[PDB]
Amino acid sequence: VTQKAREGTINPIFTCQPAGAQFASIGIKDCIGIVHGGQGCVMFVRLLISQHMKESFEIASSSVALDRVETAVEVLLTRYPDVKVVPIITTCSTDVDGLLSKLEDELLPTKFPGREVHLLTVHCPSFVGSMITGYDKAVHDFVKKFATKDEPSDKINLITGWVNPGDVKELKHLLEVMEVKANVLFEVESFDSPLMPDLEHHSHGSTTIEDLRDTANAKGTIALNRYEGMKAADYLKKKFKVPAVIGPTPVGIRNTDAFLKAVSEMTGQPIPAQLVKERGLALDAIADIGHMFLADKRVAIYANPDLAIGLTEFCLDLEMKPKLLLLGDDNSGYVKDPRVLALQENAPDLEIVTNADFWDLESRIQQGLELDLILGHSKGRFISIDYKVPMVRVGFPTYDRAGMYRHPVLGYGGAMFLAETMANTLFADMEAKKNKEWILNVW
Amino acid sequence: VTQKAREGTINPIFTCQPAGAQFASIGIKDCIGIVHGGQGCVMFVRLLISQHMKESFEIASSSVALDRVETAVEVLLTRYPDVKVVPIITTCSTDVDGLLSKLEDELLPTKFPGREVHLLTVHCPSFVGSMITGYDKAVHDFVKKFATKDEPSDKINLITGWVNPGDVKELKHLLEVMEVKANVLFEVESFDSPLMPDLEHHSHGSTTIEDLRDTANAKGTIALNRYEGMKAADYLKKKFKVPAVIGPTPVGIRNTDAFLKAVSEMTGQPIPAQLVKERGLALDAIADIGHMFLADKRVAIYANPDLAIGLTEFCLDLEMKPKLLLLGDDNSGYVKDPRVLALQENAPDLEIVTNADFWDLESRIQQGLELDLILGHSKGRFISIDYKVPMVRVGFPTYDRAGMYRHPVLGYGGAMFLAETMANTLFADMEAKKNKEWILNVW
Amino acid sequence: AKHVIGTPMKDVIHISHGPNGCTYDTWQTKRYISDNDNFQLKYTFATDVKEKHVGLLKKSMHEAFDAFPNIKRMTVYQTCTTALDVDAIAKEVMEERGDVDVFVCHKINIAWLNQKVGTVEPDYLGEHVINYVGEYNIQGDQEVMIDYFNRMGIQVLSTFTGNGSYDSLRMMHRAHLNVLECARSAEYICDELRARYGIPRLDIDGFGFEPLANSLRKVALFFGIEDKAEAIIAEEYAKWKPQLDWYKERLKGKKVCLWKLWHWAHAIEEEMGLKVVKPDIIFTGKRPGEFVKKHGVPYLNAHAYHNGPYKGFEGWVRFARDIYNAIYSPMRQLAALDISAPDAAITSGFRTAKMNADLTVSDEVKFSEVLHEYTGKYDSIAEIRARNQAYAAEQKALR
Amino acid sequence: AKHVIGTPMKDVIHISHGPNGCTYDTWQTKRYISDNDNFQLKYTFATDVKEKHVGLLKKSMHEAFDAFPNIKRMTVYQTCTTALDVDAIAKEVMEERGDVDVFVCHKINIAWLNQKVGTVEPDYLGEHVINYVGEYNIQGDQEVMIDYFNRMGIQVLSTFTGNGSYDSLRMMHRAHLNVLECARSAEYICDELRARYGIPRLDIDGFGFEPLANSLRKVALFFGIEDKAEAIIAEEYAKWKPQLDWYKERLKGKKVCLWKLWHWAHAIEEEMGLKVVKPDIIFTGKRPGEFVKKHGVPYLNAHAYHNGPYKGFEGWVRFARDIYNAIYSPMRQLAALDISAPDAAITSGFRTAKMNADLTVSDEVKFSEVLHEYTGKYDSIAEIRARNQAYAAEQKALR
């Protein structure tokens, strides 16, 4: 596996951990996080989330300062009578735990009597990992703060990872057909809010404190992403003995099959025939395009690590040729990942670059790497624009196409959407370049 | 309104009436139509439907000739023990009604005793009208053949017109939310069939003989398309006194509102808040892109007449600039259509060409018509490819993009899909031509 | 006639004297490509006969010439409706325009030969001149065989009709030899060419490695240039045989159902190891292929190919790769799996077609440093077409 | 500094001595465009400081120069993390490469003037030379105003900094006049340029028709070329005033909430008829605009514009059309309608913004054959930029 041989960065693929913590927090109902740093950090993270979703979300700042945190909490609780979860997130220049202990004894009991307010800390240094690590540590911190043993429940925990509202809609459809109830972390379908006639409705997360409390009483935890939710699943298994299944990310047909088998084993619920017909519909659509257009297509993939690995596996199943896989942070678990080991074993023409930036892709293209397609998010759009390689927008953030958050990349509907979108991007490129474009008649 | 000043045709927009009759027939359960013409006619219509849907459908031929029709009916009933509806469709060179009278007394009672077989004729000359009028006359003929008065029913008749399975899925979702039962003509969602593991499932229509019989007992008929189903609605009103509402085609927010109001008036069912929320979601997505990218975009539209008119109206609502509307047949009802009169009145830069072919668009572009977008089906793809105008694929047939039949163009989901697809086609064109492509960051 | 033979002509307005629905049904359904920007695929002309007509032909003929000023050739087809004087109208149109030629259409062979053949005269005649007959240039087959002929130093007077021009096909009577690709479509053309001008006929095969090599050797033996054919055969064998044998090792014993049945059947068994007879693949048309798709059997289009051209040595390797890709798809095994079965063989990760195919080969084949997978661009005609246009330019300068 | 002032420089590698997350957050969030293919928007450079670092800077500086061989200018920014010897490292890098210059960065004004200004000399100096200061070329504003200056026969020595080059900003000290667009970002630059070289400062406004015309007239009065400014003003008035007044008639009395607040407020009220204060439109940033979208109020981006540039006379008309399109959208009235109301004003067909806006005007305005809607292409900078590059080529030949 390639590890970036340059020390500097050109065109980073991810942002810092505090941004990932804030994104994890905005998926919780009645949660407004205070970021203990510069106001500019919160401004840019809110701008990034607004770029992805075109929706405004509430994140607070402390404007650096242990006492400034106290004033920020006081101001936030005064000016938001609905907020219940107030996570304090630390940053570059930043004992908030002892200060919160004093706050819950002095400020909350006196100034806000009878108001349910929960204060927690998410320590997110900006020079250690990335937004993936920040999301993982934030999910772990929320689960640790709220999980409480109670009466056993028939629900499972679905830690989705950093996914789109369309992915959550698809996963919940699969669970509903399987007749499985879950504590879904997180319910981000409410990120897409309506333009209502009279009463305004703002974007918010739908994961409640009750869900995070009840995570301790589940039959089991399925964490789809190994780098975005395995820490919370491991914490639950270590403290409350909740059995944890890590992965696979259900990208494509085979990985969705494995996900449904994991759900069936956890819950005892059989896989029904309706999922067989939906899987068959996806497979029929895939058979329309597979060995006519998708086979032998040379692909570069970058995304969140689990999504990128799953996309590479799905492309390999579709008879495509993944050439470059970019993993944009310094995580040491990639080399020991069994999926990465399998990719090394049976896809020898695929180069995997860890701790990568967009210059890895751009310079490899400059030196002669011929590609037909790119799977990546919008910050790498200019490689596609300038080197004339079509790109399908996947992951976070996708701000240069309209409404990509509403479509799934997970499940069978996600597999169908991915395959048909890859085909249609290829068709539009074939027409733009007039490359056998007459062939799109009697396929 | 422009009427084509050329006598000859260059690049026709529609095929002949028998093709429309066969397409109407393939939407009926256990119906296999015999086409009383050449083998090539059936071969090319089946190829066209296969181009659109990538699925094989059963249509029979007589090969030419009344004895040929009798032998064809005998052979079809022998080789298909499930077919119940056997429409005979006449063509260019073609008393099928008299022979059919004789057949139902001599062949069916003797050779097939106890078998429920219905024989009907659809007369479809190929030198008058087009596939639109053929579809209209086929729907009228089926309704006339099967409609029977019985006990009154609380259902309505929804004659959808020649639409996609995604459109039918959207319409049925709207009806289910409004809590309205319907005799949907036709149920074409089964056109998309799965690739099943062991058993084989083939594409077919889901409209039964019971639905066509029960059309006579409905509270009312809503025919979405004035040129694709108004004849059946008028026949029902004239014979069984079933009140008929013609249009509007629910393309876009306003026309979907009018459709839901028509349903509410027919049935007495109130419009619920869930439809308000879904309409608001579509409107929020539309507000993300409207006055930033859609406003002042110059559009050419050709489709089936009702869909084309509705698309023009939706584009006008989106602050776009429709320049050319192509109506590809010689129907005399276009000039007296109130929608067309409204387009003439309040859309002054829109030219409407009736009895048009693709050369109308191509020569207007040659002479200097500047366009940003085209809405049309795949037979006009080469105008888009050669003159570098992006096209969104709408209507029948769309064979050069993958799975377009599965998306709606009707309803609020259809409005959202249309608006976001036009936005994304424009975005991809902006990137291909490097036309302010840097602007796709902080919209 | 109008759909298979006449249309591949690249510089002709093919106007049908009849209704629009017949002209529509066959438009954009074929893959006869040309170097004239696919004019024969992009534009289709009908007289648009209505019930009143059951004057207009003359006006529609003039309209088409006006809209396409660079096209001076017209072919008028009579449809079923117009059976109930096209020749005179064509003469008056030619008289009025003054710089255009009109042709009034087994039948199309007799019509073309008895009217159009013998009129135009070749400007340059090489040492070795052939008429390529029965080839219609599906996905670029004609360009493949022209490349092979050019590398042999052979001038192709005309191709009937794929990527063929009107005037070249009128010059058809001054060739030294006729080479037959399809006989069921163009037997009469060459029979009567021999009858009238004594032009020898040479039936050839363009598919496979041995059939194509033998065809090239026969063509060279006629002109006494056998060494050029041998050099071509050696070069193409060295280039494409290891790649073809890579697929032949993984396709030995697979069954193919044929629904291009005899231009294919023996070379497929001999060179790809397939058994022509549940089948592993079916060669058929688009609609029957979509029918058998529901049965878990892949198909390759026998009429329009999938990733063509399938002619030539490289085209044979592309055909083998298409077969292998369809047969060994991981999606094929995923679709045959019933995930609702209690003990369903559900897995995760990925599989490749190579993993499935290598389970069938031996270790000596699996670790061969001679056999390799196909190494060719998605469009293989772009380089062949550029070579063809370079040879034409070079031959112009010498002349 | 880095995010607003330094970055618009088009031919410089802006490397941040710090973590990747800070470099990522400001990347592709601005609309400072340039004629250098938007290099300043496409590439962003970080030293990538890790926990261990809390040698690397020198190597990252060399890596960036290697990857972009056509870029010889570098600006190194110190982030919060690296506050716990960049100058010496920059000198060593310059010594080793030998053909590059490095700059170590209110503060950015002191840094540039005391380090870089005065080190380069222009080869040619026109009769009338200005420094355009405080302009950062949002969507093409700098190129709009350069076109206006070129048509006046004025040479712009340098723009600080939008679509500006490193060497021009080092040559900034030999201008006859400084024209100041923004003062809250570049006051000190002009004060110290006057202090050190006695260069007069002329504050100007580029928005509106009267503020821009008065700015052009003052610039012409300084150089005694008033007739050229008058000709420009007359031509642009005749071209764009009927189009602007078309929108001003339909925007009289509408309310705007401002969240470019005084560069705009008076000209908006005077020339567009809007009342600056439920508002009819809000001028704000992207995230607050998306917040107020939920309240049924449209927004125009006050920082990056919507369909810019908003500078110039044509840019003012584009701004008016953007306001009118947002305010009079038929979707705005569709979204405010509650279709679940028992008697809801549900309609069919369509409406246009013109239909909604014409209900507010009188019949004399509605049927004016003088006022017309905006007639301009989607990208208005392509023609202005091509004009600018032609004047540069013509001026180069004369020299």
For residue D304, count other CB atoms closer than 10 A to its CB: 19
Burial of C87 (0-12, 13-18, 19+ CB in 10 A): exposed
Method for this entry: cryo-EM
Does one domain contain both A398 and A305? Answer: yes
Which 8-state DSSP code applies to residue D82? G
Strands D129-135 and D101-104: unpaired
Local structure of C155: helix, strand or coil: strand
SS3 B147: coil
Rounded distance, CA C33 to CA A439, Å?
10
Strand ranges, E, within B314-408 = 321-327, 351-354, 373-376, 391-393
Instruction: Determine, for residues B290 and D306 on separate chains, whether the beta-carbon distance falls below 8 Å.
Output: no
Half-sphere exposure of C303 (CA within 13 A, CB side): 14
Angstrom distance (rounded) from CA D176 to CA D195: 14
H-type helices in chain C, by residue range? 20-25, 39-42, 56-67, 86-97, 107-115, 141-150, 166-170, 187-197, 210-223, 226-250, 265-272, 286-293, 312-327, 330-335, 353-358, 363-366, 381-398
CA A283 and chain centroid, separation: 25
Say yes or no: B406 and B420 in one domain. Answer: yes
Please, how many CA atoms are within 13 Å of residue C238, restricted to the half-sphere of its CB? 5
- In a shared domain, residues A223 and A115: no
- For residues B212 and B34, the answer to whether their CB atoms sit within 8 Å is no
Residue type, A253: I
Q: Which residues of chain A neighbour C355 with C-beta distances below 8 Å? A: 346
CA atoms within 13 A on the CB side of C313: 23
Where does residue A202 rank: exposed (0-12), middle (13-18), buried (19+ CB within 10 A)? middle
Rounded to an integer, what distance in angstroms lies between the CA atom of residue C94 and that of residue C115? 15
Give the largest CA-CA distance in chain D: 80
What are A9's strand-pairing partners? D46
**What residues in A contact C337, CB-CB < 8 Å?**
257
Q: What angle do CA B201, B204, B209 make, to 5 degrees?
A: 130
Nearest to A195 among B287, B384, B442 (CB): B287
DSSP element (H, E) containing B161: none
CA angle D161–D163–D168, rounded 5-degree value: 65
CA distance C192 to C115: 13
A216: Cβ–Cβ under 8 A, 6 or more apart, which residues? Answer: A147, A148, A149, A150, A236, A239, A240, A242
Instruction: Dig out the tokens for D218 from the structure.
Output: 């003052």
Paired tokens of D196: 């050190």
- 3-class SS of residue B125: coil
**Which of these, C163, C183, C224, lies nearest to C384 by C-alpha position?**
C163
CA–CA gap between residue C48 and residue A91 (Å, rounded): 74
Element (H, E) at C184: none
Whether C81 sits inside 8 A of B127 (CB atoms) is yes
Tokens 């849907």, residue located: B53
3-class DSSP state of A260: helix
For residue A14, the 8-state DSSP code is S
CA-wise closest residue to B319 among D271, D374, D315: D374
Sign of CA dihedral D4, D5, D9, D14: negative
- B226/D257 Cα distance (integer angstroms): 46
Which chain B residues contact residue A380 at CB under 8 A?
A: none
CB A184 within 8 A of CB A172: yes
**Subunits with at least 3 CB pairs below 8 A relative to chain B?**
A, C, D
Torsion sign across C-alpha atoms B425, B431, B436, B438: positive
Q: Do D335 and A197 lie within an 8 Å CB cutoff?
A: yes
Are A121 and A160 in the same domain?
no
Buried b (16+ CB within 10 A) or exposed e, D202-222: bbbbbbbbebbbebbebbbeb
Distance CA B282, CA B417 (A): 9
Task: Tell me how far apart the alpha carbons of residues C60 and C66 are, in angstroms, rounded to a whole number.
Answer: 10
- Whether residues A112 and A250 fall in one domain: no
Residue listed under structure tokens 């009312």: B220
Q: Do B432 and A437 touch (CB under 8 A)?
A: no
Distance from CA of B276 to the nearest CA of A (A): 8
**Residue carrying the six token digits 């319907």:** B182
- Parallel, antiparallel, or unpaired: how do β-strands D45-46 and A9-10 relate? antiparallel
Contact flag C59-B7 (C-beta cutoff 8 Å):
yes
Give the C-alpha separation, A331 to D291, whole Å: 36
CA D146 to chain centre: 12
- Do both B378 and B328 map to the same domain? yes
How far apart are alpha carbons A165 and A193 in whole angstroms? 11
Angle at C46 between CA C45 and CA C49, to 5 degrees: 170
Please answer yes or no on whether D290 and A54 come within 8 Å at the CB atom: yes
Which of B244, B267, B290 corresponds to the end of one domain?
B267
What residues make up the domain containing B32? Answer: 13-145
Distance CA A405, CA A163 (A): 9
Buried b (16+ CB within 10 A) or exposed e, C106-125: eebbebbbeebbeebebeee
- Residue by residue, DSSP assigns D5-30 as IITT-TTEEEEEES-HHHHHHTTT--
Is residue A236 a contact partner of residue A147, using CB atoms and an 8 Å limit? yes
Gyration radius of chain D's alpha carbons: 24
Q: Please report the sign of the dihedral spanned by the C-alpha atoms of residue D234, residue D239, residue D241, residue D242.
A: positive
| DSSP sequence for C191-254 | HHHHHHH---EEE---SSSHHHHHHHHHHHHHHT-HHHHHHHHHHHHHHHHHHHHHHHHHSTT-
Phi, psi (5° rounding) for residue D108?
Answer: -65, -25
The CA distance from C356 to C358, in Å, is: 6
Contact at CB, B285 and A428, closer than 8 angstroms: no
Between chains, do C339 and A271 touch, taking CB under 8 Å as contact?
yes
Domains of chain C and any CATH numbers: 12-105 (3.40.50.1980), 129-233+381-398 (3.40.50.1980), 244-366 (3.40.50.1980)
Compute the distance between CA of residue D173 and CA of residue D168 in angstroms, rounded to an integer. 9
Is the same domain home to A126 and A177?
no
B263 and B277 assigned to the same domain = no
Contact B281 A402 (CB under 8 A): no
Whether C and B touch, i.e. at least 3 CB pairs below 8 A, reads as yes
Short-list B164, B134, B150, B143, CA closest to B221: B143
* Tokens standing for residue A70: 């106290």
Å resolution of this model? 2.5
Q: Please state, in angstroms and rounded to a whole number, the distance separating the CA atoms of residues A140 and A235.
A: 7
Helix (H, G, I), strand (E, B) or coil at A283: helix
Residues preceding gaps in chain C (C to N > 2.5 Å): 54, 84, 105, 259, 277
Q: Between chain C and chain D, are at least 3 CB pairs below 8 A?
A: no
- Please answer whether residues C259 and C239 qualify as being in contact, where contact means their C-beta atoms are separated by less than 8 angstroms: no
- Please give the structure tokens belonging to residue A271: 């896989």
Please indicate whether, in this complex, the C-beta atoms of C293 and B379 are within 8 angstroms of each other. Answer: no
Cα C387 from Cα C64, distance rounded (Å): 33
Which residues in chain A have their CB less than 8 angstroms from residue B431's CB? 381, 384-385, 400
Structural domain includes residue A150? no
The H or E element that residue D207 is part of is: none
Question: What are the angstrom distances between the C-alpha of A411 and each of A185, B58, B173, D196?
Answer: 17, 32, 22, 68
Please give the structure tokens belonging to residue A79: 């000016």
User: What chains are in contact with A, requiring at least 3 Cβ pairs below 8 Å?
Assistant: B, C, D
Beta strand C12-17 pairing with C73-78 = parallel
Contact: A280, B192; criterion CB under 8 Å: no
Tally the residues of chain D.
399
CB A399 within 8 A of CB A420: no
Q: How far apart are CA A212 and CA A225, in angstroms?
A: 18
Please indicate, yes or no, if residue A211 is contained in any of the structural domains: yes
A420 and B399 within 8 Å at the Cβ level: the answer is no
* CA-CA-CA-CA torsion sign (D64, D68, D72, D76): negative
Token digits for A379? 């910050």
| Contact between chains at D296 and A195 (C-beta distance less than 8 A) | yes
Residue type, C198: G
The token duo for B23 is 């397409």
Residues followed by a gap in chain A, C→N > 2.5 Å: 64, 94
Closest CA to D230 of D211, D215, D217: D217
Strand order in the sheet with A85-90: A60-61, A34-36, A85-90, A118-122
C344/B280 Cα distance (integer angstroms): 43
Overall residue count recorded for chain C in this entry: 399
Using DSSP, state whether D289 is helix, strand or coil: helix
Give yes or no for a contact between A427 and A299, defined as CB atoms under 8 angstroms apart.
no
- Same-domain status, A280 and A428: yes
Q: Are residues B410 and B335 in the same domain?
A: yes
Pairing of strands C177-180, C255-258: unpaired
**Closest residue on chain D to B282 (Cα):** D335
Dist CA A369 CA A374 (whole Å): 12
Q: Which of B100, B102, B68 is nearest to B87 (CA)?
A: B100
Burial of A80 (0-12, 13-18, 19+ CB in 10 A): middle
Which one of B254, B257, B438 has the shortest CB-CB distance to D350?
Answer: B254
Closest CA to A194 of B251, B282, B443: B282
Residue with tokens 């073609």: B94
Let me know: does C136 contact C122? Beta carbons within 8 Å.
no
Q: Give the helix/strand (H/E) hosting B118.
A: strand B118-123
Q: Taking CB atoms and an 8 Å limit, are D304 and B442 in contact across chains? A: yes
* C-beta atoms of A441 and C28 within 8 A: yes
Distance CA C247, CA C234 (A): 20
CA dihedral (B197, B201, B207, B211) positive or negative: negative
Q: Which of A210, A236, A267 is the last residue of a domain?
A: A267
Closest Cα in chain D, distance from residue B369 (Å): 14
For residue D104, give the nearest of D120, D82, D122 by alpha carbon. D82
Residue A7 CA, distance from chain mean position: 27
Contacts of B400 in chain A (CB under 8 A): 427, 431, 440-441
CA torsion B321-B324-B325-B327 (nearest 10°) is 180
Among the partner-chain residues A193, A399, A443, the one whose CB lies closest to the CB of B441 is A399
Strands lying side by side in the sheet with A182-185: A182-185, A156-159, A221-223, A244-246
| DSSP 3-state of B123 | strand
- Taken in order C154, C157, C161, C165, the sign of the CA dihedral is positive
Nearest one of B248, B219, B223, B250 to B234, comparing CA atoms:
B223
- The span from the CA of D145 to the CA of D131, in Å, is 12
- What are the chain A neighbours of C321 within 8 Å (beta carbons)? 296
Same domain, A129 and A242: no
Interatomic CA distance for residues D148 and D43, integer angstroms: 31
Give the residue from A289, A344, A279 showing the smallest Cα distance to A318: A289
- Residue with tokens 């970021």, as numbered in its chain: A35
Please give the single-letter amino acid code of residue A171: L
The pair phi, psi for residue A368, each rounded to 5°, is 125, 10
Peptide bond into C200 cis (omega under 30): no
Phi, psi of C282 (to 5 degrees): -125, 135
- Closest Cα in chain B, distance from residue C205 (Å): 29
Number of domains in chain B: 3
Candidates B355, A230, A277, A10; CA nearest to C50 is B355
Question: What is the three-class DSSP state of A370?
Answer: coil
B388 Rama class: left (phi>0) / alpha (psi -120 to 50) / beta = left
Tokens 């799109």 — which residue?
A440
What is the SS3 assignment for D131?
strand
Whether chains A and B touch (3+ CB pairs under 8 A) is answered by yes
What is the 3 state secondary structure string of C104-147?
ECCHHHHHHHHHCCCCCCCCCCCCCEEEEEEECCECCHHHHHHH
Q: What is the largest CA-CA distance in chain A?
A: 75
What is the C-alpha R_g of chain A? Answer: 22
Cβ-based contacts of C288 with chain B (< 8 Å): 56
Test A280 with C335 for CB contact under 8 angstroms.
Answer: yes
The CATH number covering residue A344 comes to 3.40.50.1980
Least Cα distance to A196 among B278, B252, B280 occurs for B280
Distance CA D82, CA B325 (A): 63
Q: Are D15 and D122 in contact (CB under 8 A)?
A: no
Beta bridge partners of C17: C78
The answer to whether position B6 is within a domain reads no
- Contact of B118 with B209, CB cutoff 8 Å: yes
Residue type, A250: P
Which chain D residue has the Cα nearest residue B436? D379
Place of tokens 């990546």: A376
Distance separating alpha carbons of residues D141 and D160, to the nearest angstrom: 13
What CA–CA distance (Å, rounded) separates D320 from C244? 66
Which residues in chain A touch residue B413, judged by CB atoms under 8 angstroms apart? none
d(CA A250, CA C69): 57
Give the DSSP H or E segment for A159.
strand A156-159
Partners of residue A382 in chain D, C-beta under 8 Å: 42
Residues of A in contact with D286 (CB under 8 A): 47, 50-51
Q: Is the CB of residue B425 less than 8 Å from the CB of residue D14?
A: no
Residue B349: DSSP 8-state: T
Same domain, B205 and B259: yes
Q: Coil, strand or helix: which one is A156?
A: strand
Nearest chain B Cα distance for residue D330, angstroms: 6
Taking contacts as CB-CB distances below 8 angstroms, the residues of chain A near D74 are none
- Detail the DSSP E strand segments found in B214-342: 221-223, 244-246, 298-302, 321-327
